[PDB]
Structure formats: structure tokens, C-alpha cells
Amino acid sequence: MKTPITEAIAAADTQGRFLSNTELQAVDGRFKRAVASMEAARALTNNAQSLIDGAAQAVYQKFPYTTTMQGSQYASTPEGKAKCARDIGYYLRMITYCLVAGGTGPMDEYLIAGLSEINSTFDLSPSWYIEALKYIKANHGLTGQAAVEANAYIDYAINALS
Amino acid sequence: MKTPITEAIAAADTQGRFLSNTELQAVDGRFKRAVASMEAARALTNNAQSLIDGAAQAVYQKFPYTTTMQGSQYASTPEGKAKCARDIGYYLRMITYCLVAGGTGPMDEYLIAGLSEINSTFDLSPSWYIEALKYIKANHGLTGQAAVEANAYIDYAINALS
Amino acid sequence: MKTPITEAIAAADTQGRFLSNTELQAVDGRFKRAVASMEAARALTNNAQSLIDGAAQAVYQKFPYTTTMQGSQYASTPEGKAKCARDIGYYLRMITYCLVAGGTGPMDEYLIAGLSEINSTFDLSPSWYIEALKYIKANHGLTGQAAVEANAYIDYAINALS
Amino acid sequence: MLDAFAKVVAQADARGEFLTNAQFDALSNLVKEGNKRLDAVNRITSNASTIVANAARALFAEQPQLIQPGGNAYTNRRMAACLRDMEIILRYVTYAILAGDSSVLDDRCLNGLRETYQALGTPGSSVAVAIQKMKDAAIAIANDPNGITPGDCSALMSEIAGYFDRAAAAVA
Amino acid sequence: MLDAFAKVVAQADARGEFLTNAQFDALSNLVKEGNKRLDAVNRITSNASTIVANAARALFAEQPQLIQPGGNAYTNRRMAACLRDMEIILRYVTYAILAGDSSVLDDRCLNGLRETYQALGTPGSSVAVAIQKMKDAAIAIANDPNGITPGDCSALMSEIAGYFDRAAAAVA
Amino acid sequence: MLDAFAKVVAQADARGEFLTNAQFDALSNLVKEGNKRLDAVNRITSNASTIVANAARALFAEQPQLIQPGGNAYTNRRMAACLRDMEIILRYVTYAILAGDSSVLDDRCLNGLRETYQALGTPGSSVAVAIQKMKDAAIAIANDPNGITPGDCSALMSEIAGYFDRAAAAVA
């Protein structure tokens, strides 16, 4: 998995050499940012439901056709809304993993890779999830760096969906 | 083994893709030619002996030195003529396999590959077999496409021997 | 291992071909030189001690600091002189292997490869051994080709240490 | 690889004999039925994406454990890998249909597959279910009476089912 | 590979749940102790050559059979290879210290190592002794109170000893 | 690989000792016999094609099953492969003769050969017969008294027979 620490090690390992000073400086930089990133992840984790449930509706309110339009890939049926809420948690959970791991690695491995094929195959509209994300970016009531770091992974998630 | 059908598949397989329309058209083309090619193979198969035995002599009549010239690689001895008749059948059998399989693949795999080394090592004169082939090309009493297809593999066999 | 004979074979083997005349001529050349090289190795082997022990002192007499300077990599202690005499034998033994095998192969494989790392790691001064070698080059009382061949591997050993 | 004709040739060559009348009649029969074979390959090929997708939804709805966190199809990279496998199997199956012989399917695709999934932790019995789901989807699509000249195609559909079944038995 | 944070993330992902307070406290604790980890990596790394060398002399003096003609460390190319191995192990150990997880060490270095030495005739138990010799050299160097801000570092040194011990147990 | 001299050097190095008088006398003896060795390599090499061919005819006439349709030497590509193998073995044998040691033969050619033929269905016992046929052809050619300075060469021919026999025992 990609993290500032693992990249550093991969770089020295590919050259059969011991870690360098610059790489050590990079891990220190990662530790200094760990503070605000960690409290961001804790905050988000403590406001899962209000964010998840709040994100769910923010997408039915902008894509109401998904509310009753017959089709398994829709939130017309209760299970459809179950699947949907499940996916929302997945996204929120991933961004907290990024904040925890100091990078996108977690989200790249578990969610981004194969994302397009998955959405294409099961006919899921990327915009649905993007609305979810825009709702979380403006709801997590985070400020300072904590908010700064979170929004970073949020936007990053938006890109990959576009 | 090489056949119009297998080549088509190899082409799509090397590109990890499903079969294309052109490839499908190629197999159809192969099926349309299958008719005359198959009856050619049946005809030849029904006139094995008369062709084989007739081919044998057509080469003793042009290379009589092989009739008594001492040397295991010669038809001087009865076993030498046995070996020789055996080889003739091999050739006839192969051309029918080509007509059956819609291509040279059968003859390339079982007879052409290593042909030169085999003739060099056991001291066999390519001309012997070529005379055999010229006798069959003018004896199989085939007409129309059936004859057309047969002669194709016959000439092809001549080339490889030259 | 590298020897005039093995190189010849490696050359033909890398080309999947039988040995050539030139390669055969090379082995003959090796056999002709074998005479003087072999008697050189026998001579040296018969005057091991006088050469080894004589080589040991020729280096304490030029590097007396190694006589009592505290440090395991020194001949200050008796075991230090043991190690040292051991190493001297190793060198003498190798040059005789070269004379026997008609080349440097023996010395390249068993002693030259990793030489620098070994001397660096255990803090051994290359000059110590080089003094040893200069003493043997001028002590083996060899003359003619026998001496010529020996000196060749001796100098060769000096290079690698420089 | 071999196709129907090549296999018969290989079987005859090993006996050093010319084809028998039963073999000639058999190969000639396949040719006469050629159009149907081409229609099945064309129809299954044109719907490949639909067959895989519908079969995937079917499998996961039937086996919800696979899509649970920590199951072999969780995460988008594993799901993408699973959908890909299903497409690989299907692709090689269409290959065997066009050839009238399962060699290409066996040699390029089924050989060693069982071991590969065992080493990854991927449940083979579950791959078989997906392969079976595609068989039914593919067959219904290939044997659909709409938009095609009516005729018997029951021999071909059995041949096609055989290949799928043969693929499922190589990983079950 | 994984680092301390990544492993916790992977353990949580497999359960499809967000980190618990105990996991957050644990990762935050590692961060607060960050400087010490960096000092240990930096100190062990800067002395790598000394640790290997001293450990080598120690091992061979303790096991004189290895340097006897015909033993696995005789000849300069085998000795060079042995010193190299010791450096490889050490290098990967420093890697695991910087990451706070032994995955890189296991995956790139320990996996299959036992078999590799058995196939070469190299005595694994002897490699372990060398690995143990380096542990003591490295730890004394990393936990030296001179030239560093006094503080508790006893948790880190146990973690570091674990990695070395874990490397020795993979070849003993 | 090793040659006669190299092997003796390797045996002495492993004991950390200089060559003994018996070893010196032995290597010097080989040198004195050098011309004969060169004549055997040169003679076997110049006739390589004849040895292989005659041995092939001999083997197949003795074992007609191999050239029957479906046997391992049927078809020109398999026969070409068989003649090629015989040439490969011979080539490596001449290699061992020139070196006075069977290492190159063992390491490049005999190692694993048994398994290779078993995996292909090629009968090892039959390869041995071919190898034995070449031994007799090669030896008669190398020890022929015509066109060469008369002398004892009986030690060399035994050494040469050993290599062939050793090659046949690796696949029988």
C-alpha cells in the first residue's frame, strides 16, 4: 500500500541502499501532518451516520428518479437504498483510511482500482457518489488543517469519478 | 495446427479480444471451400493403392539406379521398396489431411518440418518423391475445384522438397 | 573455473557447435606450456615453509607496527601471526594452483573475487600481502620458463591488490 | 490448438491411416451446419458484456458472502478481477465453439486454473456457479428464435453447454 | 508492503468498519514517539558497516569451522557473500523499523530464505547467530545515551529486537 | 565447469593443501598423453555426422516400434528432434574428452535429462541404446590404426567409453 513511509522505503529498496537523510526527512514531514489528519479521521468517524444518512438524501434530492425508477441499480427498492447507503459508508470509511495512512494508497487499492469497470458493469452513475462527496465536504464542519487534509482526499475521490 | 479457423482464433487471442466479423467471414470462406476440398480427399483416399503403387513405379522408371544399387537407402532390396511405398503413402495421406483441414498445417507439422535434415541424414533424393508427386498430380483424375485444391497442396509439397 | 581448455569449450558451447581446429590448437599450446608450469608448481610446493615463513618476516621487517600494535587485525598477538601465516600459505597455494591449471582461474575464483571487500571489512593492508609476494618473486630461485610462468601469476596477484 | 477437422486428422495420423467414411461424413456434416455455428459465435460474442454482467449480479445475489467486506469479491479491484475472469472464460468458450473442439479452451484457459484459484483463496465452486450462470444466458441468447431463419440447432446448443460445463468442472 | 498505519487500515477494511478509539490512540501514540524511531533508524543506518563487521568477527571467532578450508565461508567470494547477506538482512530490518511493521522484511527478505540456504548447504543456525550478533550491536548503538536527548526508548528497542529475532527464527 | 587439472585443484583447495606428488604425477601424465586426447576429439568431431546417422539407422532397425505411426520418432519433426538429441549428447561428450572431466557433460547436458524425457513420453531406455550405438561408432573411429602414429591409446578409449556409458545411465 502507498504511504509516504512505504514510498520512501520502496525508493531505497529499488537501489539496494539504506535509507537516506531526505527519505528520513520525508517521514518526519509525514509525522508532523499526522496530528491534524488523525483528528480529522476521528471527527469524521464520530459523525458517520449523520454524514452517511445526510449524504444519502442529498443525492435523492438531486436525482429523485433513482427514488422509484424500476431497476436493481436504483434506490427505488429498499434494498436499493441499502446498497446505496452501504456504498456511502464505503466512501466515508476510505477517506478516513487515507487521513489515517497519510495518503491516497488506501482509497486507490480498495476503491479506485476497477472503479470505472464496476460503475460501467453495474450501471451506477458516478454523479450519484460525487453529490455524496460534495455534501460531505460541506458538512464535516472541520476547520484548520484537519479540514484541509480531509477536503484533499475528498476532491481526489471526485477526480477519479470524473 | 494451422487451419484457417485456428489462425483466426490465434489472431484474436494474441489481442485478448473476442472474434471479429472479418475473422468470422474467413471461417465462412473456409466452409464454402470445404465442399470441393472434402470430395477431393475422399476421391484420393478411394484411389490410394492405384495412386501409391502407380507412384512407386513412376520413380523406378525415371531412377532405375534405385532398383538394384546396393545401399539401404535404396529400393534395390524388397524392404527398400517397402520403405519407399511406405513413404509414398505418407505423402498421399498428408495431402488428404490438408484438403480435410483446409490448409497446409497437417503437412507442415507432420512432414515438412525436419524434412531436409531427414533426407540429408538418411540420404534420400528429394527428386524421388517429387516424381511421385508429379505422377499423382497427373493421375488423380480430379476436375473442377476438387482438382484445383488438390494440385495446390501437391505443388506446395514440391516446393518444400526443392 | 577458467582454464585455456574450459574457455575453448565455453566458446564452442555458446555457439552450439563442435570444437574447432583453432580451439584444438589452443589446448595443444596449453599442453606445451604445462611442462615448465608444472615443475614450477612442484618446486614452489617443495619450498612452501621456507617461502611462507620467509615471506612472513619480510613483511614484519617492513611493517613492524604490525608487530605489537594492539588490534585483532594485527600480528601483534601470536594468533595474529597465525592468521597472517595462514593467509601467506593461501597466496602461495593459489599461485601453484594457477601454474597447475594453466591460468588465473583458480586464483580468481578462490581469492581475487571479494578480495577488496574482505580487506576493507577486516582492515587488512594490501601492501602487507604485496610485500609477501615481492619476496616470493625473488626467492623461488626459479629460472627459465618455470620462473617466467610463476612471476606471471605473482605480478597478476599484485595488480589485483593494487 | 486443434479445430474439429484438425483433431480428426491428428487421430488418423497417429494410426497412420486415411480418414474413414464415418469421419468424412462427420466432418462434412459439421460444414453443412456451419452457418448455425457462426450464428452462435456471433450472437454470444455481441452480447458478451450483457452475459457477464447479468451472470455477475445473479451470482452475488445468490452468494452475498462474496461481496461482504473480506470476501473474495469485495473491493473494486477484486470485483474488477472477477468480472474479468468471467469474461476470459467466456471469450475462450466462444473460441471453442468456432473451432468445434475444446483444445484452445483447455490449453490456454482451463489448464492449471484450479490450482491458481486455490493459491489465491478464490473459491472454485463459486467460479463454477458464475460459469453456469453464463451458460444459461449465452444459450438463451444463441438459441433465440427471433431475427433468425428457423431451423434445428439443438445439437450445437448441447455442444456449447458441454464446453461451459467442462469449464465449470475444471474449477469446481 | 505495509507500515504501522497501513496494517491497521487493512485490518479494519477487512471488517468493513472505521477505526476504533484504541486503534486511533495506538497510531497517535506511535506518531508522538516518532522522533525516537527516526533516531534508531538513523543510528543503525550510519553504523551499518561497523555492525556487520564486528558481528562477522564475532561469529567466526565463535565458529572457526566456517572459515576452515571447505567451510561455507572460506574463500573470499563466499566470505564476501556472507558479509553481503548480513548487510541485506540488516538493511531490511532498518526498513521494518522505519515502517513499524515487519511486512517488507518478511515479504522481500525472510520469505523462502530458509529453503535458499538449505539448497546451498549454508547452515541456517549459523546465519541466526550472525543475526543475533548484529541485534546486540545495533541495539547498543541505537540506545546509547550519548549525544541524544534523554528519554524512554525501551518500547522501541523491544520492537527492534523483535524484528531481528524474527529474522533469526526464519533461518534457524 | 572443470577440466582434469581444475578438478584436482578444487579437491586440494577444499583441504587447504598443496598438490601431492601422486596428483602432480597424474596431471603430468595426462599432459604427456595430450596428443592422443587431441586425436580422439578431432577424429570423433570430424565424423560426428556419420556417427549419429549410422547409430540412428541401427537403433530404428533394432527398434521398429519407434518409427511406427504414433511412436516417438514418427513424423519428420520428431525424427529431426531425435537426431538432434543424439548430436547434442555426442557434442557434449567430445567436450568432456577434451577436458578430461565429465563436469561440462553432467552440468550442461545430463542433469535433469531423465525427467525431461519422462515428461515428453520419450523412452529413456531407447535413448541409451542410441547413446551406446554412438559409443561403438565413435570408439572404432577414434582408435582406428590407419593414418596415425602407432601407440597405446587404450586408457583414453576406456575414459571415452566411460563418458558415453555415463550418459546412457543418466537416461536408462
Ligand SMILES: *[C@@H](C)[C@H]1/C(=C/c2[nH]c(/C=C3N=C(/C=C4\NC(=O)C(CC)=C4C)C(C)=C\3CCC(=O)O)c(CCC(=O)O)c2C)NC(=O)[C@@H]1C
Ligand atoms: C441456431 C443457432 C439458431 C438458428 C440458426 C440458423 N442460422 C441459419 C443461417 C444463416 N446464418 C448466417 C450467419 C452468418 N453467416 C456468416 O458468414 C457469418 C459471419 C459474418 C454469420 C454470422 C447466414 C448468412 C445464414 C444463411 C442465410 C440466412 O440468414 O438464412 C440457418 C439456416 C441454415 C441453413 O443454411 O440451412 C439456421 C437454422 N436457427 C434457429 O432457429 C436457432 C435459434
Ligand SMILES: *[C@@H](C)[C@H]1/C(=C/c2[nH]c(/C=C3N=C(/C=C4\NC(=O)C(CC)=C4C)C(C)=C\3CCC(=O)O)c(CCC(=O)O)c2C)NC(=O)[C@@H]1C
Ligand atoms: C531512544 C532511541 C534514544 C532517545 C531518543 C530521543 N530522541 C529524541 C528527539 C529527537 N530526535 C530527532 C531526530 C530526527 N528528527 C528527524 O526529523 C530526523 C530525520 C532527518 C531525525 C534523525 C529530533 C529532531 C528530536 C527532537 C529535538 C531533540 O534533539 O531533542 C527524544 C525526545 C523526543 C521528544 O520529542 O520528546 C528522545 C527521547 N533518547 C534516549 O535516551 C535513547 C537512548
Ligand SMILES: *[C@@H](C)[C@H]1/C(=C/c2[nH]c(/C=C3N=C(/C=C4\NC(=O)C(CC)=C4C)C(C)=C\3CCC(=O)O)c(CCC(=O)O)c2C)NC(=O)[C@@H]1C
Ligand atoms: C590413439 C587414440 C590412437 C593413436 C594416437 C597417437 N597420436 C599421436 C601423435 C600426434 N597426434 C597429433 C594430433 C594433433 N596435434 C594437435 O596439436 C592437434 C590439434 C590441431 C591434433 C589433432 C600430433 C601432432 C602428434 C605428433 C606427431 C605425429 O603425428 O606423430 C601419437 C604419438 C604420441 C606421442 O607424442 O608420443 C599416438 C600414439 N595412436 C594409435 O595407434 C591409436 C589408434
Ligand SMILES: *[C@H](C)[C@H]1/C(=C/c2[nH]c(/C=C3N=C(/C=C4\NC(=O)C(CC)=C4C)C(C)=C\3CCC(=O)O)c(CCC(=O)O)c2C)NC(=O)[C@@H]1C
Ligand atoms: C447510492 C449512491 C446509489 C445506488 C447504489 C447501488 N450500488 C449497487 C452495487 C454496487 N456498488 C458497488 C460499489 C463498491 N463496491 C466496493 O467494494 C467498493 C469499494 C469498497 C465500492 C465503492 C459494487 C461493487 C456493486 C455491485 C455488487 C453489489 O451489488 O454489491 C447497487 C446494486 C445494483 C444491482 O443489484 O444490480 C445499487 C442500487 N443506487 C442508487 O439509486 C443510489 C443513488
Ligand SMILES: *[C@H](C)[C@H]1/C(=C/c2[nH]c(/C=C3N=C(/C=C4\NC(=O)C(CC)=C4C)C(C)=C\3CCC(=O)O)c(CCC(=O)O)c2C)NC(=O)[C@@H]1C
Ligand atoms: C469471479 C466470478 C470470482 C473471483 C475472481 C478473482 N480472480 C482473481 C485473480 C486471478 N484470476 C486469474 C485467472 C486467469 N488469468 C488468466 O490470464 C486467464 C486466462 C488463461 C485466467 C483464467 C489470475 C491469473 C489471477 C491472479 C492474477 C491477477 O490478479 O490478475 C482475483 C484476485 C484475487 C486477489 O487480488 O488476490 C479474484 C477476486 N473472485 C470471486 O469471489 C468470484 C467467485
Ligand SMILES: *[C@H](C)[C@H]1/C(=C/c2[nH]c(/C=C3N=C(/C=C4\NC(=O)C(CC)=C4C)C(C)=C\3CCC(=O)O)c(CCC(=O)O)c2C)NC(=O)[C@@H]1C
Ligand atoms: C598477514 C599478511 C598480516 C595479517 C593478517 C590477518 N588476516 C586476518 C583475517 C583474514 N584474512 C582473510 C584472507 C583470506 N581468506 C580467504 O579465504 C582467502 C583466499 C583463500 C584469503 C586471502 C580473511 C577472510 C580474514 C577474516 C576471517 C578470518 O579471521 O579468518 C586477520 C584477523 C583479523 C581479525 O581477527 O579481526 C589477521 C591478523 N595481520 C598482520 O599484521 C600481518 C602483516
Ligand SMILES: *[C@H](C)[C@H]1/C(=C/c2[nH]c(/C=C3N=C(/C=C4\NC(=O)C(CC)=C4C)C(C)=C\3CCC(=O)O)c(CCC(=O)O)c2C)NC(=O)[C@@H]1C
Ligand atoms: C553469513 C553470515 C553466512 C553465509 C552466507 C552465504 N550466502 C550465500 C549465498 C546466497 N545468499 C542469498 C541471500 C539473499 N539474496 C538476496 O537477494 C536476499 C534479499 C531478498 C537474500 C537474503 C542468495 C540468493 C545466495 C545465492 C546466490 C548468490 O550467491 O548470490 C553464500 C554463497 C554460497 C555459494 O557460493 O555456494 C554464502 C557463503 N555463509 C556462511 O558460512 C555464514 C554462516
Ligand SMILES: *[C@H](C)[C@H]1/C(=C/c2[nH]c(/C=C3N=C(/C=C4\NC(=O)C(CC)=C4C)C(C)=C\3CCC(=O)O)c(CCC(=O)O)c2C)NC(=O)[C@@H]1C
Ligand atoms: C521411395 C520414394 C524411395 C526410397 C525410400 C526410403 N526411405 C527410407 C527411410 C525413411 N523415410 C523417411 C520419411 C518420412 N518419415 C516420416 O515420418 C515422414 C512424414 C510422415 C516421412 C516423409 C524417414 C524418416 C526414414 C528413415 C527412418 C526409417 O527408416 O524409417 C529408406 C530407408 C533407408 C535406410 O534404412 O537406411 C528408403 C529405402 N528409397 C528408394 O530407392 C525409393 C526411390
Ligand SMILES: *[C@H](C)[C@H]1/C(=C/c2[nH]c(/C=C3N=C(/C=C4\NC(=O)C(CC)=C4C)C(C)=C\3CCC(=O)O)c(CCC(=O)O)c2C)NC(=O)[C@@H]1C
Ligand atoms: C532419439 C535418439 C530419441 C528421441 C528424441 C526426442 N527428443 C525430443 C525433445 C527434446 N529433447 C530435449 C533434449 C535436450 N535439449 C537440450 O537443449 C539439451 C542439451 C542440454 C538436451 C539434451 C528437449 C529439451 C526436448 C523438448 C523440446 C524440444 O522439442 O526441443 C523429442 C520431441 C518430442 C515431442 O515433439 O513431443 C524427440 C522425439 N525420440 C525417440 O523416439 C528416440 C528414442
